[PDB]
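yo

u said u wanted the structure for the complex thing, so here. seqs first:
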Amino acid sequence: QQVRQSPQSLTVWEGETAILNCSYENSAFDYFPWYQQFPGEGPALLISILSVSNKKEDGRFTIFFNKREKKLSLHIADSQPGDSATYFCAASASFGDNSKLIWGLGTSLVVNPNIQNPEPAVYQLKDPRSQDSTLCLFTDFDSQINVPKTMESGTFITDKCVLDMKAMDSKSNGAIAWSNQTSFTCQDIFKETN
Amino acid sequence: MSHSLRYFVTAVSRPGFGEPRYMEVGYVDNTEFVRFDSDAENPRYEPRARWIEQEGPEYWERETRRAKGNEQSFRVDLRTALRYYNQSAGGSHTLQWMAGCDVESDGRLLRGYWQFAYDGCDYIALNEDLKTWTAADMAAQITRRKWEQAGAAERDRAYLEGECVEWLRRYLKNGNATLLRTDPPKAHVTHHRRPEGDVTLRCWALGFYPADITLTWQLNGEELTQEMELVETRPAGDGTFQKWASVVVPLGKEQKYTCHVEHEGLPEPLTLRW
Amino acid sequence: IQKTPQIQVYSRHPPENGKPNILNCYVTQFHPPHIEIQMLKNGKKIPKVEMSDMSFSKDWSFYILAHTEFTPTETDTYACRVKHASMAEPKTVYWDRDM
Amino acid sequence: MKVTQMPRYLIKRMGENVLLECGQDMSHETMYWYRQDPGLGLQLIYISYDVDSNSEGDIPKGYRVSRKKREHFSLILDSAKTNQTSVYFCASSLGHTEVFFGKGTRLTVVEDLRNVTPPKVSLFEPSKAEIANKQKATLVCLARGFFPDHVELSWWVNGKEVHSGVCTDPQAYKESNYSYALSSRLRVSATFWHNPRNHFRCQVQFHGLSEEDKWPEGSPKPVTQNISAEAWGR
Amino acid sequence: RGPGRAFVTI
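structre next:
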């Protein structure tokens, strides 16, 4: 309410400038820190600005501030998949009577890798066991493809997961599926390419 | 010319007598215009000058909240000081704070202030660069390291270069009639024979404003360095000031010594004698 | 530490017998801020004495301005008595009208 | 120059008392306790300005705190409810400046301790169709059947933990009501995989019951443990 | 208007 971030979720492609918006209601707010939180970790101060400034730059990160409109934004230049995180904007009246920080609800950022010449295929992997080795591996598909979901019992398809082979310098999309029913193959489960 | 907006703050611990005494006083130049007292019947910022009364209810509510927030900081600080210096919790101690801006004719910032004192002695002070701190002892070195890591000076500088300067301009405007007025000094010379032949000639200057004044007993040119004793300029109830200067002269030759006052409230410097 | 108060006593206008005036007691340069100040008429405490609240100068030292309305006579004496932890005994400064 | 939080993971039966501890080394006077539901925002439970100087946050109900020393800040749950299952962050700052957060505490309040179970970890060798047509080899690790979702998956190659070519699911998925599933994959060159002396291991660390909890003696006690799956190259 | 400590304690 007091601090409102938008959008809830933002998806950009790498190399593009990511822009995370925020507006506030209390005109007495004069301190605006942005916190970056990676999954499984605690938030950490990324960059902050005072209301007397219109711009604050630190590396690829810039805060632009408009006091009259009670609006600001975090700009991430040359965004990388590693920037994928939840970004919180907060605010406080520094000359107020308490040390409480007023938090925005956060914006989850997803930075897609640039997939040049996508070659999407589905591979079946096998484990040193007998029962279901139907582990479908959907990989090397383009970043705008929506990975299908399933309602079948015992069958499940994971969300898209981006890995970075730092050596060889290569990023690729991936999704894994399995099912207690080998009655299904791996091609019935998905519907993209081979 | 040069003007200033400054706030003078005191926290005084008083074990066994409740929470620390907390006081904030605001000055434009040397004129008090606002005051907060924690011991007042109703703890809130109060007007102390005429021209500040025109500020709306939101002004007084905002400033009161600021003072109450500050009071809590100083409460914790007084306890922290006991830790640092390894002092007993049974004695009274003081923490003082002065912050403000000196601004010249254009609007340029001459100097910004943001400094502290503990038990009457320098503790820590923001340097003229408004970026670095000067710590006065080992306890203050801890404070300096904490404030450096926290980047505390950035907001302080923002206040001094911005808010302080802007509001001083407003205050000078609204209080122009009294703040920037001039009252000329009324001067006279007294005569007292010391029990040892000589004569003490004292030159008085009364009812002048502002306090800045030059009192000079003369001779035959422009000497009289250190045989003329002064008193520091002292205030009156009505906001005006008084001051005197005296010299010891041989009996009879009192008529060669002359007194001269210099003040911006005068068209020309006064010339007095006995 | 402890700083000894400086005490100055003076009238607003040049003293004239039978003419109402204002007598001031200006106490400066002391620490700690706790202090007791009394203005005296013929050795007796003056009832209605106005006094400023706790305030300090740029050098961190505290000061207090006390004043009262009075009418000088040639027989009446006036003084200001100050008690402070920096002094072993209270200090009384007499108003010198001839200065 | 950090905030330390213990424990990192915790499992409690409803009704039991909970104590989360926190420490900071920055001489900060102000400390905080936050809770954060997965994918949601930071909710302030309590703020402490000094020793024995605490104030309620937005959601103090069901919680209380203890600040007897400036360096520490304890969060106390007298009677744990299931809706208090969340991630708790301790924090400190020097007033309105940088807030330092701990690494967090994953607290899960369950109705029945007997359904806490370690994961079954299975490692899948790469498809030769991938190796031939793309010159890359993707290992896939799958952990299933565990409850609650207190698992940490890591990849180890030749005795060293790798981070490159690795992508693990950010959040476990619920198979049933008492069964979670987490997957991850490691992708290396076909060349690196064809080396028979390269050792791969998918380690899944499960955070379960501590030691003081009582468990029957007709079944293994779901204690905090590491469960791995190894494989060699061609 | 006056300065704030902003709870930046010593």
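The CA atoms of residues 95 and 118 of chain B lie 5 Å apart. The domain at 1-181 of chain B is CATH 3.30.500.10 (Murine Class I Major Histocompatibility Complex, H2-DB; Chain A, domain 1).
cya
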